Design a protein around this ligand. Structure first.
Ligand SMILES: *[C@@H]1O[C@H](CO)[C@@H](O)[C@H](O)[C@H]1NC(C)=O
Lengths: 49, 50
């Protein structure tokens, strides 16, 4: 699913010495859920990069 | 939740604010006993405050 795929992408970004990122998407309703999940994960910064 | 007696300067300021803005006092001690700032929860569950 998209929710876990974003987590896998972020975990991969943790390696390779990557900390700064920026995402571009479209207006599809399914993509907006991904954007909201990414924003919530960014707001969830108690652990991680 | 036994009733304790707390006083000092902060409570006096609170009483002054309540009298100026027609408020009420419901002072209750924090169960955690700490300020409760941002902390890392167990097993990386989520971000929250205590
Ligand atoms: C204070 O505000 C309360 C609002 O619940 C009001 O009933 C009361 O008359 C006010 N007292 C004064 C002195 O203005």
């Amino acid at each position: 699913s998209i929710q876990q795929q974003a987590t896998v992408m972020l975990k991969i970004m943790q390696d390779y010495d990557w900390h700064v990122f920026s995402l571009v998407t479209t207006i599809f309703p399914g993509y907006r859920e991904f954007i909201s999940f990414v924003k919530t994960t960014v707001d969830n910064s108690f652990v991680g990069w | 939740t036994v009733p304790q007696c707390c006083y000092g300067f902060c409570i006096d300021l609170l009483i002054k604010l309540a009298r100026t803005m027609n408020f009420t006092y419901e002072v209750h001690l924090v169960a955690d006993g700490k300020f409760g700032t941002q902390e890392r929860v167990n097993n990386s569950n989520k971000k929250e405050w205590n």
